[PDB]
Design a protein around this ligand. Structure first.
Ligand SMILES: Nc1ncnc2c1ncn2[C@@H]1O[C@H](COP(=O)(O)OP(=O)(O)OP(=O)(O)O)[C@@H](O)[C@H]1O
Ligand SMILES: O=C(O)c1cc(-c2cccc(Br)c2)nc2c(F)cccc12
Ligand SMILES: [Mg+2]
Length: 259
């Protein structure tokens, strides 16, 4: 249905693993979108196709103001193209580099929009498994938008930086919707402290710290926050709350700026 000669390409937006994201314009409508270019050669030598076809299946069907739209796909000689909703205010990764750390207002607000989009995802039995500030894009009004559904899959189920992965996942063990709640705790901590609660210098140390759940809150972290992070960073996936509790938590309700 789509062809490259329908788009006026532009400036690069971010580098992926198997190709770059570029700013683009649909000639006939003047529509601004972001093109995610992937290379068949690269995806081949890794065996990601399935996941790339899964990413597209999952993302094309989901509709939420806190989830990035996938408007379609196409492919050339060696490139695979994904037509996405352009996020004009970049990523949460860049914003955290600038600000160093976020205030309770900003953090609660992001945690609220994150939980929101997650409920939707989980209600269709879809687990993201790759919730990272690198994959959390910002829309024109500063709204959070989950992106990159490469690692998403239908719940339950059996690579890169370990940080945002729950112990069940890093240990091959079977996993469900509760995986995304561990990520939610890791993100909250990182939003307030400026670093994830298990960061190390080696893949090796990170694994040990995650498996043991070895984390220590610095001075400036309030009780209200300390409580929710600890509530979400439980080794037992069933001992973790449901997004509903997260959304209604005193510290969230008190600090989140609603519409
Ligand atoms: N719609 C968009 N608008 C603005 N920037 C984007 C958009 N999509 C991606 N980017 C930028 O491009 C980079 C790549 O994003 P993405 O995570 O989709 O690629 P990826 O990590 O290779 O995906 P995958 O996890 O499937 O390999 C990100 O750092 C992001 O900042
Ligand atoms: O040329 C190919 O056979 C090829 C196609 C695709 C593809 C086609 C439509 C939608 C999507 Br999502 C992907 N992907 C490929 C790939 F990932 C590696 C090698 C070849 C292809
Ligand atoms: Mg990514």
């Amino acid at each position: 249905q789509w062809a490259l000669e329908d788009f006026e390409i532009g400036r690069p937006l971010g580098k992926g693993k198997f190709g770059n994201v570029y700013l683009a314009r649909e000639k006939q409508s003047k529509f601004i979108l972001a093109l995610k270019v992937l290379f068949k050669a690269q995806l081949e030598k890794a065996g990601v196709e399935h996941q790339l076809r899964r990413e597209v299946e999952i993302q094309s069907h989901l509709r939420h103001p806190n989830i990035l739209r996938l408007y379609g796909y196409f492919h050339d000689a060696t490139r695979v193209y994904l037509i996405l909703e352009y996020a004009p205010l970049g990523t949460v990764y860049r914003e955290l580099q600038k600000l160093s750390k976020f205030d309770e207002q900003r953090t609660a607000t992001y945690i609220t929009e994150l939980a929101n989009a997650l409920s939707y995802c989980h209600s269709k039995r879809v687990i993201h498994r790759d919730i990272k500030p690198e994959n959390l894009l910002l829309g024109s009004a500063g709204e959070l938008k989950i992106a990159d559904f490469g690692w998403s899959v239908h719940a339950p189920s059996s690579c890169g930086t370990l940080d945002y992965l729950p112990p069940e996942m890093i240990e091959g063990r079977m996993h469900d919707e509760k995986v995304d709640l561990w990520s939610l705790g890791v993100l909250c901590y990182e939003f307030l402290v400026g670093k994830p609660p298990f960061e190390a210098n080696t893949y090796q140390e990170t694994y040990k710290r995650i498996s043991r759940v070895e984390f220590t809150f610095p001075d400036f972290v309030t009780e209200g926050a300390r409580d929710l992070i600890s509530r979400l960073l439980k080794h037992n996936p069933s001992q973790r709350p449901m997004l509903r509790e997260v959304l209604e938590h005193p510290w969230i309700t008190a600090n989140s700026s609603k519409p």
